[model samples]
Target: EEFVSVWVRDPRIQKEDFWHSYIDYEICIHTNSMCFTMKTSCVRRRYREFVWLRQRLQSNALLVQLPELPSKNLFFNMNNRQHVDQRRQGLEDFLRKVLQNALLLSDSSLHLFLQSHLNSEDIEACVSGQTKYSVEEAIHKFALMNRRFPEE
Candidate 1:
């Protein structure tokens, strides 16, 4: 049996724009095989990418209660060191819960995300491959059930 574990740490300011700075995170994956060998991989990701990843995971996999993201703020409050640490801790807790979902361990997107250095193309391709049942799609399909709705 293959066992997978993930942990997130080392939050750093990776990028800054005219508006604000972005926090980047490092995710570490540890895999253990029945043969007794262990393998580890570390991937760096930004908060926005993490948001997108969680969205895809929740949508594609079976029902699992995911962890909530840190509340988005328009400005970076560097003065509040405690608050920043709290946010990072909260993110770590969220990731731990997400990885606990057994069904998601084998998901193609999740697997690739944890095992490799992902690029924009890879992220886009993965998103495109998943079956998206977004609210817009649901609303569109629901409208189709009403005969009064005209097909355009």
Candidate 2:
């Protein structure tokens, strides 16, 4: 297990210019969490917008589709094939966050956390990300490459 900090922003607050966003970083124990900061400019608040993007990554309705990553294949032209591995690793790490969050929402800890922290609607939205058709559409698409979409 590892930990990653995340920041959150509410769209309503985004319209206002005065500190409309917050860096709600939390140390969470997920497999990919540890590797994230190591690769990026984790200094100052450079990663703040990224944190916002990640926070919204919780649901398909919020994200619509995965963001476009830099064309990592370019590294191969520079004889830096290792970067391809890094890119693959990055994707894997994100997947870990998605899968672990999915599993946690079904667990007792989330149940207890919800009682004290999140409202019913928030909890429901978070849980919906775990399904095949929503947040994990990339995984679902991968799975579909081998077979038909799993029956609902």
Candidate 3:
């Protein structure tokens, strides 16, 4: 069986005035299989892009209960280093949650996301395709996890 993992690293705020401010993320992914190992180079993403990616994942994969991102504050304390650190840690926690689910880890949308070279628009389109993830024997898994069905 092939296993995959993803994590969020190095998060820094870019100060380009109020309208242009954004957090930059360095993300990494690794794939382990019986035959070979494929580790991706660190990829860069902006905060909004991360939100978009997660939204895409959740909206597309009806069977998976995707992790929720940290709430965005209306008035951010840009000068507070501690607040920034906490936010970064929260983002990392979200990635860890996603990686814990093997079904989500193997999505093509996720694989496309962790690489350094892909365009954001391309990834958005790729994940837009509806995916039906049906696991007949995993009904109990979903129930135990308190996951909602597609029709629910």
> lDDT winner among the candidates?
1
Clashes of 2: 0
Candidate 3 residue 30 C-alpha distance from true site, Å:
4.1
Q: How accurate is candidate 2 locally (lDDT)?
A: 0.34
Where model 2 places Cα greater than 4 Å from the true spot, the runs are 1-79, 103-152
Instruction: Quantify all predictions' global Cα lDDT against the true fold.
Output: 0.61, 0.34, 0.60
Off by over 4 Å in 3: 1-6, 15-19, 30-37, 73-75, 126-152
Best by TM-score: 3
Comparing 1 and 2 by lDDT, which wins? 1
Residue pairs that clash (backbone atoms under 3 angstroms), model 1: none
lDDT of 1 by residue, 48-152 (tens): 776777887788764766679875655445457775676667667777777666676545566555555555456456447643543234324433442346766
What's model 2's lDDT at 11?
A: 16
TM-scores for all predictions: 0.65, 0.24, 0.65
Candidate 2, 60-126: lDDT as tens digits: 3453344443333324332354543444345335434543464333332233121223333443454
Better of 1 and 3 by TM-score: 3
